């Protein structure tokens, strides 16, 4: 589908332009709040040792990527489900309609959702998401991993999100908008167009985060 290849290309162009080594960095000029994401990962729990990775999207929907490479998504209505098999095949169900084969997986998903509500902060709680574009589809988590510095989450709409552990800063990259939103140590959020970062530059801190994102994106590519 080309999303990751496109993202790698956008990050290579911006990083090749050396955005922190300019006479006058004017990061604020690259700002475009029109490109705020529809979706990002708000919370997560890694129980990969035997259940899977659970997460919450900013619209209060929840999902799990189970150890058997399957996924299950609960919409924010609390009932509408989407199940996705190993090879991408998608079924649409309800928790009311009770296919016995998924009751254990649904039980687990509900435990994850309860766990996240009771114990975990909502990243980007102070962000109004962009309105989705017409028959707007809920994404699921394609791939994820974590290093020592960060967790890297690749959603099915092409966006990748990198949450750094040390300082709690967060990047969300969208290859469709060709944008990056940066969430600061103080939870301050800005969305930037990658083409304008090329033109105007950005501080060292974001420059390093974007260099790290390219290598993370190459890694995501190498799994393929």
């Amino acid at each position: 589908d080309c999303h990751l290849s496109d993202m790698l290309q956008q990050l290579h162009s911006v990083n090749a332009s050396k955005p922190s080594e300019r006479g006058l960095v004017r990061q604020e000029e690259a700002e475009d709040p029109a490109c705020i994401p529809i979706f990002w990962v708000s919370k997560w729990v890694d129980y990969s040792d035997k259940y899977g990775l659970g997460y919450q999207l900013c619209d209060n929907s929840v999902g799990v990527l189970f150890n058997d490479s399957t996924r299950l998504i609960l919409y924010n209505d609390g009932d509408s489900l989407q199940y996705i098999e190993r090879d991408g095949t998608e079924s649409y169900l309800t928790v009311s309609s009770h296919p016995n084969s998924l009751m254990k997986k649904i039980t687990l998903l509900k435990y994850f959702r309860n766990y996240m509500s009771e114990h975990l902060l909502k990243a980007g709680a102070n962000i109004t998401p962009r309105e989705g574009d017409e028959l707007a589809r809920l994404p699921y988590l394609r791939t994820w991993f974590r290093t020592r510095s960060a967790i890297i989450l690749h959603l099915s709409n092409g966006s990748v999100q990198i949450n750094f552990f040390q300082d709690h800063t967060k990047l969300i990259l969208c290859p469709l908008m060709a944008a990056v939103t940066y969430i600061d140590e103080k939870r301050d959020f800005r969305t930037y167009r990658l083409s304008l970062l090329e033109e105007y530059g950005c501080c060292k801190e974001l420059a390093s985060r974007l260099r790290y994102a390219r290598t993370m994106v190459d890694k995501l590519l190498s799994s393929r």
């Binding site: 997560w44 114990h119 975990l120 902060l121 949450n163 709690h168």
Partner: peptide
Amino acid sequence: MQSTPL
């Protein structure tokens, strides 16, 4: 492992 707590 966990995301940031309340």
